[model samples]
Target: SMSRAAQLLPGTWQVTMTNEDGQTSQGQWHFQPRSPYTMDIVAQGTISDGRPIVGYGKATVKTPDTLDIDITYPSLGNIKAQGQITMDSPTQFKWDAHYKGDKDGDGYISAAEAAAQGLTGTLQRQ
Candidate 1:
């Protein structure tokens, strides 16, 4: 029988975040299961203002309930976001993101900005 974690690997997920001001962003992510707790993701989406966004991230399944990912190459600019994923079901999950920028002022996005932009979402495997 497969372990619980094994059951959650190798899938695609999609999320939509709606801001407090009622703006929304939707993203689709895919995970390619690999050994040693590693996964690859392709994220493509748009922001509230209709800004085109695209990126890639790498994930590590730290535990059954914990996932860590680093996403980069945002279309708004060269910025990165670190996110945590919480497994809610075999095919459902939630995410929280923190913005990171380039080595020397690549970009800046604050928590307030993230909140205003709605940085959280529920995802379902596809």
Candidate 2:
């Protein structure tokens, strides 16, 4: 009686984000099944500069092969991003999110940015 959507996302995943500069940061994403089409997500990562990051978000099931997500990290002055997931396997996917960073001197993170520059990365089941 498990939802197909939750089954696709499953438990925890090892997240790795490789920036445009070819720098990589290791992270973790833990998914808690909340509804038939929603996943409560909490994750942690760091900037290459050693700044720690904690994110709170959720993933809404969009299709058997897709998911829509949004995460807000208070540490980065409460930055927010809306992302999408395209899965090649039930065990993993690359999270591609929009650069929804708020306006101000804080971090321009303009929508004009590229998804290749977003938090998108491969998630390995762990």
Candidate 3:
């Protein structure tokens, strides 16, 4: 079962991402509780290219302050990503993830690769 802290995360969230180049993107995340320990997540946004992006995932409470997520972005050919969500406050959180494939064809998606792509963002409950 999820703890009280885990329950606080299921709701609508507004997210903004700023890339390394200073470009920004906005998105909405809707989290629905699937069980006492898991939540279904849907996200919608636009990337720098101006095309709409949609994704689906599941979040499982791993600890009182942490949730693990596995999401698939169809726009990127169902690219899978693994990430963690950390509760910063009752209404705020931080998220970061790394994609499975080598998007840049640079052999691997290491910290440098993920950082270069800017996959971290803040989520504000709305």
In angstroms, the error of model 2 at 66 is 0.7
User: Each candidate: what lDDT?
Assistant: 0.69, 0.72, 0.76
Give RMSD to native, each candidate: 4.3, 3.8, 4.1
Stretches of candidate 1 off by over 4 Å are 1-3, 18-22, 102-118
Residues 9-97, candidate 1, lDDT per residue (tens digit)? Answer: 57777877654456678888878777657788888888778876688888887676767888785575666777778788888888886
Best by lDDT: 3
1-126 in candidate 2: lDDT tens per residue?
Answer: 334645767589988776545556688888988877889899898867666768889988787777888888776556677777777676778777644344222665555432323555888888
Question: What TM-score would every model get versus the actual structure?
Answer: 0.75, 0.77, 0.78
lDDT of 1 at 15: 77
In model 1, the Cα lDDT at residue 25 comes to 82
Q: What TM-score does prediction 1 earn?
A: 0.75
Which candidate number maximizes TM-score? 3
